């Protein structure tokens, strides 16, 4: 059960071996090394979970060494595992193994096969370190690792400059989030003297009995890091533009590892967030606003992958809303189910991209059910889990617990935002589905897991996360009824507009309608705003400074010396009479100076 270090080391070994292989090995050997390392991590995770459940679900600690020891600054290299760490580790390892298998089938004949698998293995290793760390600095190591691996994998096809631009954009935005997280770490060490999660939770109420300002600052910066990595407000543009990379990269980023890191960080630091309730309600507000903007953008998108990206942003906003309403179990359960159906949706989208053999627009497609029915079924079940089809799919149950947690705590604005977001999700999901489709062992595995079979899995968060307040059974019944009615109404209504298109073209041609559609197509103008206030002044200051003005201003005395020497050399004209005259002038000056003192 002491093989948590094994779950770190095995993807690290895979990354190191495949990186030093440098493409010389065969495709089968590279696939064996990468997928086998990730699958071995998954199997060790399975055995760890079995023994964890065998011992009554007790938190286990595995220290390795002391990372830093400078006086009172003691940072340890220690892993910890509880129910939340087990759930995140199981999700990361299993979904990453399925994505690794599909990528092994999908990347055949591509350049950089072993480089791709080395980068994904380092991605898995970094996220395992992120979820297994017992202190914030080791979690920051994992955080920076997943940021670097996402940069390396988004710009995988490095010859296309758009891919590199998207990767650089994602890395810079995530690094801004990581700087916010670093601020949180500095605050928490300066106040509590430690960065261990359990020790910080234990020492926070005693230290912050008088003033709670620095803890609120630390939790606000923790949320800043979380929205940096989970692609929320106000750092959400990178997920929109990260479609330049390949499809298993998108599946790993959206389902397995990258976007779940902020949700895990908020869930793991839940004691500090509960000590600052205003910041926790701000987490809920951020999630609600982000899912609203993501749904409204997802309806007006033009490509399949952009719709999937904004759907990922919407469900991460749902998880942030669930964390803000203290529905921690609902948030983690929705994390697992969303990992399942979003990985399935990305796999089916990659299959239909390979079938179309081009980056074709969705408006040309139609009547593909008679050619590729299995991909249609996978897309349909992934959308039904996405759009919360009642009593058939796990996403309906996860969103039901999220809405029950929102109702039971006494937040009305977040409740109605979640309801209209479920409506919006149904509209954009079946818009995409009926626009494209009208007019494989991993695929079976996450097709099964995108049904109630995936809802049967209960996350063991009893000892680690606090239980959600119980809604009344009658209120739960009406909430389930109205959630099913909202989802069915959205499905039927979107099927009504997007089955010829007559009413959609009315708003799709009117000037306020064109203005709203183009405003929601440009990520609500956040890309333009960030280009205007951050990127363009950076380029302007760089162009202004490119000639090194401080070097010239320090070179000014050399210019003065050259000018003074050239001026002084004019008195050396070579005339003897002027030399005698200068001697007499100097005699006059010396005599006058001696007389005036």
């Amino acid at each position: 059960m002491n093989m948590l270090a094994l779950t770190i080391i095995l993807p690290l070994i895979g990354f190191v071996l495949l990186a030093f292989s440098r493409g010389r090995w065969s495709e089968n050997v590279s696939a064996i090394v990468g997928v086998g390392s990730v699958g071995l991590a998954a199997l060790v995770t399975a055995f760890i979970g079995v023994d964890f459940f065998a011992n009554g679900e007790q938190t286990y600690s595995q220290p390795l060494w002391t990372w830093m020891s400078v006086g009172d600054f003691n940072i340890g290299f220690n892993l910890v595992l509880d129910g939340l760490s087990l759930t995140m580790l199981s999700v990361v390892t299993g979904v990453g193994f399925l994505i690794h298998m599909y990528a092994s089938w999908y990347m055949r004949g591509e350049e950089g096969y072993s480089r791709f698998f080395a980068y994904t293995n380092l991605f898995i290793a970094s996220m395992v370190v992120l979820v297994l760390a017992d202190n914030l600095l080791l979690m920051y190591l994992g955080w920076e690792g997943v940021g670097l691996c996402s940069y390396l994998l988004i710009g995988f096809y490095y010859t296309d400059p758009k891919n590199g631009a998207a990767a650089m954009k994602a890395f810079v935005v995530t690094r801004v989030g990581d700087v916010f997280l670093a601020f949180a770490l500095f605050i928490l060490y300066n106040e509590l003297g430690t960065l261990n999660f359990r020790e910080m939770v234990e020492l926070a109420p005693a230290h912050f009995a008088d003033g709670n300002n620095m803890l609120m600052w630390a939790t606000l910066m923790l949320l800043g890091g979380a929205v940096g990595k989970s692609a929320q407000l106000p750092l959400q543009t990178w997920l929109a533009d990260a479609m330049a990379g390949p499809t298993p990269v998108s599946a790993l980023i959206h389902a397995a590892t990258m976007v779940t890191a902020g949700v895990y960080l908020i869930a793991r630091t839940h004691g500090l967030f509960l000590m600052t309730p205003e910041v926790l309600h701000l987490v809920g507000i951020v999630g609600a606003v982000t899912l609203l903007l993501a749904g409204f953008a997802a309806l007006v998108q033009t490509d399949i992958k952009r719709v999937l990206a904004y759907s990922t942003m919407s469900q991460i906003g749902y998880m942030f809303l669930a964390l803000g309403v203290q529905a921690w179990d609902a948030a983690i359960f929705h994390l697992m189910t969303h990992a399942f159906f979003k990985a399935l949706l990305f796999l089916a989208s990659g299959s239909v991209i390979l079938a179309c053999h081009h980056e074709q627009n969705i408006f040309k497609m139609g009547g593909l059910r008679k050619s590729i029915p299995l991909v249609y079924l996978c897309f349909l079940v992934g959308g039904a889990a996405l759009s919360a089809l009642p009593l058939v799919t796990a996403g309906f149950f996860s969103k039901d617990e999220i809405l029950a947690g929102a109702m039971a705590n006494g937040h009305i604005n977040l409740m109605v935002a979640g309801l209209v977001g479920a409506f919006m999700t149904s509209l954009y999901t079946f818009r995409m589905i009926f626009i494209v489709f009208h007019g494989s062992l991993p695929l079976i595995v996450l097709l099964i897991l995108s049904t109630f079979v995936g809802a049967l899995i209960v996350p063991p968060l009893q000892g680690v996360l606090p239980q959600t307040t119980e809604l009344a059974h009658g209120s739960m019944l009406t909430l389930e009824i109205t959630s099913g009615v909202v989802a069915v109404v959205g499905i039927l209504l979107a099927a009504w507009l997007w089955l010829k298109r007559t009413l959609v073209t009315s708003i799709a041609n009117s000037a306020p309608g064109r203005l709203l559609s183009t405003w929601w197509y440009n990520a609500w103008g956040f890309d333009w705003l960030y280009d205007k206030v951050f990127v363009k002044p950076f380029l302007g200051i760089a162009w202004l400074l490119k000639r090194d003005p401080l070097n010239s201003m320090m070179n000014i005395p050399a210019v003065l010396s050259r000018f003074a020497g050239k001026g002084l050399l004019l008195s050396e004209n070579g005339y003897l009479r002027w030399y005698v005259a200068s001697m007499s002038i100097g005699a006059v000056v010396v005599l006058a100076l001696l007389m005036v003192l």
């Binding site: 830093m68 010859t159 890395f171 810079v172």
Partner: protein, 504 residues
Amino acid sequence: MLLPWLILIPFIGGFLCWQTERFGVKVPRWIALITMGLTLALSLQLWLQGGYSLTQSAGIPQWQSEFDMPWIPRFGISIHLAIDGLSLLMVVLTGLLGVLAVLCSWKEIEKYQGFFHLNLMWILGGVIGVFLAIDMFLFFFFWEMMLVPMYFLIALWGHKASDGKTRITAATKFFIYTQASGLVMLIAILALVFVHYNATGVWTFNYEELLNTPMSSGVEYLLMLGFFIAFAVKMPVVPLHGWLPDAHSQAPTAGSVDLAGILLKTAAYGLLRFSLPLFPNASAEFAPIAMWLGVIGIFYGAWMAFAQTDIKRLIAYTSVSHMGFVLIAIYTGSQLAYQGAVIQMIAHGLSAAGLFILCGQLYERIHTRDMRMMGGLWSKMKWLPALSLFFAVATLGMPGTGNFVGEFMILFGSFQVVPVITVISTFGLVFASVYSLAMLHRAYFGKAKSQIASQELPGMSLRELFMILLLVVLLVLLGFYPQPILDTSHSAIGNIQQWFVNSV
């Protein structure tokens, strides 16, 4: 006892490299490797026998070793060497960088290669002498005698593609900057010695006796300012930096000169060893100015690095930004930030050494430093773009490399002392990520922007590959296990910190 031989072995090795030039052209590289390996192994021996991890702070002075021999008794001047944990880390770094410099110029088979080796070991012995001397005149003597070999090889052995006038201009700029600042430091040293002689009545240049010098507030400020002007030219601190990119760009093509002379941070050592214990009150009043100069250095060096089309100038401005971080660290008065500054000095030496070696190799293969003439080099080279990716990843301060340990320990201590400066510096870390990714995209990614970038390039030799991988392994070990380095320099850093905060 073994420190006089620590300074003398590079000098005799370079002298013999010049003397046995007659026996062959490929002879003096082996002698150079032998003497740099001897200095490195002797430093490793004195580290292993030092027992610095079991040393407690017992005030200043406290040396592992010391030695005194009267040289100019008229002024009370003696060859006075000493060593403790911080200076030992600096001399071990000097030996490792000198070995790398010798390995870097291995294939330079020229008629006057023996004189280049003699100049290189004069430089290395001078850096070691600055790191070991505790007589003020003698320390200044080494501080200024590092200059002449460095000037002569920049002016004569420098970047061959540029004209000789450009190399001569860069060498003269570097010499004038550092020698004028050294003369200002000499003025401060002489004034301190005369003030102590007026207070007591004995001639001394000993650092341990000049510590208890009763001075008025304002004279101590001026002495501190002279020391700081020398240590700020060599740090580099803005705006006294431009000699550094012009000297890196006109350094010899191999890259050995960047390793031997520049990438050793004697100015940070001088600020820790001399500016803080001799003038603690003046350093305490000067701290906000130095911290804001460090912030300006961080952001200005980042913006300058992004603006370059030359890779070498980009790496030089990166060094400027990192040393802005170190300058913020030194004036905090914080033990955690001081230890972070030591780690950052070592990690910057290793990472900038790797960057400069890789840039020299890339210039050897593509014959240009212009980043608008290269692109898509990931598909053309076997090892260079990935190792450059590693060293640019370490450059931005990625955890798992020693730069992260140094930068973040600096920022932890600084946030305990100065929070706003720490916040601005972490956004400087964002800027570091921006320029590192810009260099990676402009050099190795995209499409080929010229004809030389469209051709398959030869793979690196095994010696350069192995020394780059040694730097990689040392950086990774520093990032994951910095504890031996912290235990080595805990006592000296603790004594300097206690003397600095128990005097103000």
